[PDB]
Amino acid sequence: XXXGXXXXXXXXXXXXXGXXXXXXXXXXXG
Amino acid sequence: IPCGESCVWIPCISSAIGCSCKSKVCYRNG
């Protein structure tokens, strides 16, 4: 799930549609 | 659906129940 933002000091960029991150936010599958 | 949290200052702690920041407010499923 997720999909709003997050990162924990960078990361993300939406994963270009694909999500990313983990503990610090992002999302995708979850 | 707004989850009961805004996300101007800080990301959504309600990410723990699947909410995410959209247009300054934490939402899930509209």
Side-chain angles (χ1 to χ4, degrees), chain A residues 1-7 12-14 19 25-28, chain B residues 7 11-12 15 18-23 25-27:
Chain B
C7 47
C12 296
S15 59
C19 306
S20 61
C21 191
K22 304 299 163 56
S23 311
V25 179
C26 301
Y27 287 93

Side-chain angles (χ1 to χ4, degrees), chain B:
Chain B
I1 308 298
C3 299
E5 185 186 359
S6 71
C7 47
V8 176
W9 311 113
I10 287 304
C12 296
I13 290 87
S14 55
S15 59
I17 63 161
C19 306
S20 61
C21 191
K22 304 299 163 56
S23 311
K24 316 197 297 182
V25 179
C26 301
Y27 287 93
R28 190 174 180 182
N29 319 125

